[PDB]
Design a protein around this nucleic acid. Sequence first.
RNA 1: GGACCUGGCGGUGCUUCAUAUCCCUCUAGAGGAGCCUGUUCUGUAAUCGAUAAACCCCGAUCAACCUCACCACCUCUUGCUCAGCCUAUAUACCGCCAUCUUCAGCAAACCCUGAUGAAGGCUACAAAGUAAGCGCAAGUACCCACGUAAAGACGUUAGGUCAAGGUGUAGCCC
Lengths: 316, 101, 132, 138
Amino acid sequence: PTSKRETYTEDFIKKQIEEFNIGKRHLANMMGEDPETFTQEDIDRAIAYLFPSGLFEKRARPVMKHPEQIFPRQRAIQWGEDGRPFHYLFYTGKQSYYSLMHDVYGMLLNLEKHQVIGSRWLIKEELEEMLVEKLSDLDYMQFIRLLEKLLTSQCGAAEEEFVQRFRRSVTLESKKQLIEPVQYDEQGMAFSKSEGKRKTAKAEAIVYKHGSGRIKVNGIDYQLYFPITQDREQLMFPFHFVDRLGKHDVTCTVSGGGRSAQAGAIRLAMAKALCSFVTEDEVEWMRQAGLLTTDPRVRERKKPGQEGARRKFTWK
Amino acid sequence: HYVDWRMWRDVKRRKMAYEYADERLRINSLRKNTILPKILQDVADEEIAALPRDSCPVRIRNRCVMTSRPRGVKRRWRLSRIVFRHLADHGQLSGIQRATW
Amino acid sequence: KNRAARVRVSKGDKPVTYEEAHAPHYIAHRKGWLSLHTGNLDGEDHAAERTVEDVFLRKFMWGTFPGCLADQLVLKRRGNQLEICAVVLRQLSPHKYYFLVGYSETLLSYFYKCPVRLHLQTVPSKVVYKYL
Amino acid sequence: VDVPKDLTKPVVTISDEPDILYKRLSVLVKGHDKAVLDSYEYFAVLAAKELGISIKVHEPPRKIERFTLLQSVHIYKKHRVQYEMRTLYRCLELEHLTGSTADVYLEYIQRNLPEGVAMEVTKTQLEQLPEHIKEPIW
RNA sequence: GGACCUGGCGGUGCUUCAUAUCCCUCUAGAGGAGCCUGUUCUGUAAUCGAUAAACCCCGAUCAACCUCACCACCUCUUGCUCAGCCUAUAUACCGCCAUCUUCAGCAAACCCUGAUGAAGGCUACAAAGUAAGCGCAAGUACCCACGUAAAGACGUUAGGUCAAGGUGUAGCCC
Ligand SMILES: [K+]
Ligand SMILES: [K+]
Ligand SMILES: [K+]
Ligand SMILES: [K+]
Ligand SMILES: [K+]
Ligand SMILES: [K+]
Ligand SMILES: [Mg+2]
Ligand SMILES: [Mg+2]
Ligand SMILES: [Mg+2]
Ligand SMILES: [Mg+2]
Ligand SMILES: [Mg+2]
Ligand SMILES: [Mg+2]
Ligand SMILES: [Mg+2]
Ligand SMILES: [Mg+2]
Ligand SMILES: [Mg+2]
Ligand SMILES: [Mg+2]
């Protein structure tokens, strides 16, 4: 047999730790830095200059990391020279998984005797790293069922720490629009500037705090620039929703796209710039009305063997 | 030592088109105008038609330089689609990659 | 099904290289290019003449270093210069390598009117990426 | 311990003629890899600061040339393969150079230009009105 | 001949499905006319190939001569080539593909069952399966997490192409 799984022992990895430390001092002499305060971010920056690779895959580019982040964690020898396995559940095959179920089931019996947002249960792929054991989907569910059962009971302080280990954290980005900084012009008028995008159209809108409802697109009155009523309706929508028509002066400049792509791009820009002159509650209503979201619908490409993007040539 | 006789014929064609390029240019210039008399233009119509057929550039064919394939040829690399892909599929053509978008 | 530049699966006794183990749809994602010049850049010319030189150089080296090439050539061009970089086996004696370096460098410099330099990197045995 | 006691320096003589003044020097480099152009910019910008040259860097929009070819040798028209060439740019706009300064700098960066990277140097020279243009020949 | 196994099939059963799909249902079309274009017949002294799905503006991102391989007439003979051949065979092949694939299988090496037959191999409150590797998946590209491309194993149809090129075999060489 020619194909053998590359097994890395502790002595081999120990020699790799010495070559990285020596290589870390050489790379600092090349770049002229101080070896002592040479972090791993600088190594990533120096290896990207000395070995410039434009490969889209970032895992296929040159990398000079610590051997503990490259080589995978391997199941260590599971017995001594005599041959007796250290752990008492070695012959199960999943001594780490069953030792955890044995511990969790032992804490649920003591409870009987004496008697949240932002957090998620450890995923399957993350639970095989704590145990270094391959786990099936069904076994993972069984473990989660015992932890939940643990929580319902009147668990002690120590148990809370145990469960917390298996509860990973999720950073949830508050769905709140980012208010633009109100600026002041030479005369002293307050306004807010924002940008929009629709299909291939890009728009910049300036919304003055006080105005007589005058809109100028590219230096032209909006009714002249937009003859079709539908386009004018889109412009009104943001202001009508916040029941403040005829109170601001807008000066926008849209470029690219077509008739209907330019209005949508202006609507979104005005709406974003009109969030600085309205209350927080009104901005959430605008968001729930679809006035602050960028429509991602763009033209789909045509495929070599078809008449269109999705249309197919006639089947004979 | 060319791929085939078809390639060899074009090689001669291209060699004879380079020798008469100037002579044909000077004679056509007379024909391509409304200034000179028809009598002189009619004499130039017989002089450029008496030159060898292989001097005419419309007989030159852009074949592949490796397989002498007349059709399916890329002018920038002078290769057929089959020979171009072979070198492109093996990463031998600088910059050439498969497109996905 | 697609066949180009793909090594079909086998029992497991067939050793393939990194370049030989990746298909054409990885040429710019996991692989680079074996030749690097400007001919194929926007607004550049002489892409058909740099290509013919590459096809011949790869054959000249394959027949001039028989049995000694572990992997494909990496041709590099910088101005007038042409740099051939190769991975070769250690079976052949060094005396014969130096002869082939001065013969190929000189012959190819008078044939393509350019300074040609060849950089060998000997390896004990053909580096194996995986066994298909 | 073995080091040259003395060194010989290349002769650079000062001529009697005037020098050429370049209002702007624009270097446009093309390539297929963006990392080689980001690595070439660092060397070119650092070499200018050490020589005392004003330099500005921007990145023009890339171009992608695509074309399609038949997948099979014979028939099977509906099945094709698409290939592309990606060209990435990087413009280094230097200003207020001289002929001698531009000469050595361009040679230095041009020689170290990496494989697969072209260059287009546009030079804007400052001249003076010719004598004949000063006054009409009445 | 008897009795089994596998696979295929069934105008075979149950149940659950099909989201542009089997049917109904929504929208624009085809077949009707004229033209363009390909093919088949017929015709001509006057190519070839593809040719149910998976051929038919297909090889050709292309034929006034050339391309050209076809026909008729004339001509040459170590001949552009240390010759040559678009001669036959794709049912000898590489190479590049189609197709099922708008799939989810595929499999080395072991183990067990069946009395050591072909064969077969699950039940999570678990009853003999474990599995590197290939694929899917994941990553990547494009305007993201979406979607579209790309990818898509082993096999099937002795599928397609000796006329891309190369090539085994048989054949031609005033
Ligand atoms: K059956
Ligand atoms: K109709
Ligand atoms: K019709
Ligand atoms: K085949
Ligand atoms: K043959
Ligand atoms: K052939
Ligand atoms: Mg359409
Ligand atoms: Mg005319
Ligand atoms: Mg396909
Ligand atoms: Mg036909
Ligand atoms: Mg003819
Ligand atoms: Mg013939
Ligand atoms: Mg076949
Ligand atoms: Mg995706
Ligand atoms: Mg596809
Ligand atoms: Mg995939």
